[PDB]
Design a protein around this ligand. Structure first.
Ligand code: HEM
Ligand SMILES: C[C@@H](c1ncncc1F)[C@](O)(Cn1cncn1)c1ccc(F)cc1F
Length: 470
């Protein structure tokens, strides 16, 4: 049987439609019939799925030779981010690029970001049409996407980029973002207009970033703390070569896209969940009074860390809504399941879904319930029991006895996690100070999840009520 093949009704299209609408149900159904191993092919390819912590570990801590990350994602991502970065290079190069970024994301940089982020959010609320007036409704995703783009560009991308978003960067991003179109799952190369727009934006962004850098050199200065003034200096690879401006530009673009899509989606889910749960939001608010005090002094890198429930709300949301549902590798050499008869072959993709474990009864009783309090068992912005293996950058716990891996594990694990927590936690705390949220009358629960795009996000246009506090 090799790995059980998934009984479907058509060639090529296979089960993909089933996948596309909802993978998790799809995976679960598959699980029920076939257990922890499946095979369905989506589009062209045979994607082999290993569920379970072991399923997770196998693929995520899979051997460098045996599974390849870039061959799967490079075409799609590479046109977008640019050449030579992320997946446009051998793994070793990737590891050094992660190193530079993680280098640029130390606590003292993180500290520097918090005031900037609180400033952008507070400025947005004051100056934006979104929250004008005491009581109102607003478009969550649109509103939240703007906030995350402002907060990340000010802190991480820096002043010039932030300034640009006022002019010309908004459209560029939107155009570039078309590179993540579902047809681009198959046809990234083809010169459809949207692809031609994508290529046009990518070039233009690169020219801009490069001019920003060159201008900095021209004055040969520094001032705080963006990954930019950081990649200028964290120039050098082991070979002794400093990172070229173009690479810096393409790295920034990658970080921009990555952070924005992940942040905006997650942040959206947080606002949506909170709207459903006025009790939690008040508790969050009550936490700030209790822990920071009645005065509600300004949020800092230090005092944020006390927001245990805020931390929990993010964790709980990540558990159910994290935008990445499927992690995929290209099988380079046939691989032996430690357990079983099945052998996984080269014509195959391997797909792991930590979200599944994430929403399993064994691992999480009543998993589908969005309850932050379930975490009263533990909290880690940084986690847990397993071994730490250093690949390049730092010392990453590939640890995989954890059912909960929103940020992945092994050599491909997120280096943006701390930043993401900082950003989300900060945005959440501010909003909680400023607002109450309710559902529109007669509206219960939350919209559905749209898995059609590479990242997943709330489906429709969802409005929710906002009430201000003073
Ligand atoms: C909630 C937000 C985020 C989530 C859920 C998230 C999730 C993940 C996941 C699951 C992976 C591993 C995927 C794989 O092995 O292919 C990953 C890797 C990564 N993430 Fe994130 N991420 C988030 C935010 C960010 C941010 C803000 C950045 C940049 C600032 C970032 C940059 C990266 C990078 C560079 C990798 C490396 C992937 C690789 O080496 O192949 N992420 N992220
Ligand atoms: C490849 C992509 C992905 N992988 C698997 N399933 C869905 C997906 F969107 C992703 O892992 C998403 N991601 C990672 N951190 C934030 N977002 C990724 C990683 C690094 C990056 F530089 C850009 C980027 F999109």
């Amino acid at each position: 049987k090799t790995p059980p093949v998934v009984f479907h009704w058509f060639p090529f299209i296979g089960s993909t439609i089933s996948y596309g609408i909802d993978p998790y149900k799809f995976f679960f159904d598959c699980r029920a019939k076939y257990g922890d191993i499946f095979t369905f092919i989506l589009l062209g390819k045979k994607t082999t799925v290993y569920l379970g912590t072991k399923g997770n570990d196998f693929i995520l801590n899979g051997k460098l030779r045996d599974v390849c990350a870039e061959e799967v994602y490079s075409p799609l991502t590479t046109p977008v981010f640019g050449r030579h970065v992320v997946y446009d290079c051998p793994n070793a190069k990737l590891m050094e690029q992660k190193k530079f970024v993680k280098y640029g994301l130390t606590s003292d940089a993180l500290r520097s970001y918090v005031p900037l982020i609180t400033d952008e959010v507070e400025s947005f609320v004051k100056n934006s049409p979104a929250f004008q007036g005491h009581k109102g409704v607003f478009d969550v995703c649109k509103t939240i996407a703007e906030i995350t783009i402002y907060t990340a560009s000010r802190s991480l991308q820096g002043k010039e980029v932030r300034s640009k978003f006022d002019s010309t960067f908004a459209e560029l991003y939107h155009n570039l973002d078309m590179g993540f179109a579902p047809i681009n799952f198959m046809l990234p190369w083809a010169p459809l207009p949207h692809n031609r727009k994508r290529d046009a934006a990518q070039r233009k962004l690169t020219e801009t970033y490069m001019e920003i850098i060159k201008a900095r050199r021209q004055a040969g200065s520094k001032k705080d703390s963006e990954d930019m003034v950081w990649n200028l200096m964290s120039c050098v690879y082991k070979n002794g070569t400093p990172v070229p401006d173009e690479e810096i530009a393409h790295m920034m673009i990658a970080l921009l896209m990555a952070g924005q899509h992940s942040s905006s989606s997650t942040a959206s889910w947080i606002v949506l969940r909170l709207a459903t749960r006025p009790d939690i939001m008040e508790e969050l608010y009550q936490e700030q009074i209790r822990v920071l005090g009645s005065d509600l002094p300004p949020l800092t890198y230090d005092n944020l860390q006390k927001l245990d429930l805020h931390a929990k709300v993010i964790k709980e949301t990540l558990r159910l809504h994290a935008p990445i549902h499927s992690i995929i590798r290209a099988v380079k050499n046939p691989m032996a399941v430690d357990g079983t008869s099945y052998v996984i072959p080269t014509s195959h993709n391997v797909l792991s879904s930590p979200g599944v474990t994430a929403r399993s009864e064994e691992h999480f009783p009543n998993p589908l319930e969005w309850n932050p309090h379930r975490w009263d068992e533990n909290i880690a912005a940084s986690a847990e029991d397993d071994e730490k293996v250093d690949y390049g950058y730092g010392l990453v716990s590939k640890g995989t006895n954890s059912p909960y891996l929103p940020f992945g594990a092994g050599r491909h694990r997120c280096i943006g996690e701390q930043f993401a927590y900082l950003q989300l936690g900060t945005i959440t705390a501010v909003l909680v100070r400023l607002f109450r949220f309710r559902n529109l009358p007669g509206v219960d629960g939350i919209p559905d999840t749209d898995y059609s795009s590479l990242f997943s996000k709330p489906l429709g246009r969802s409005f929710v009520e906002f009430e201000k506090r003073h």
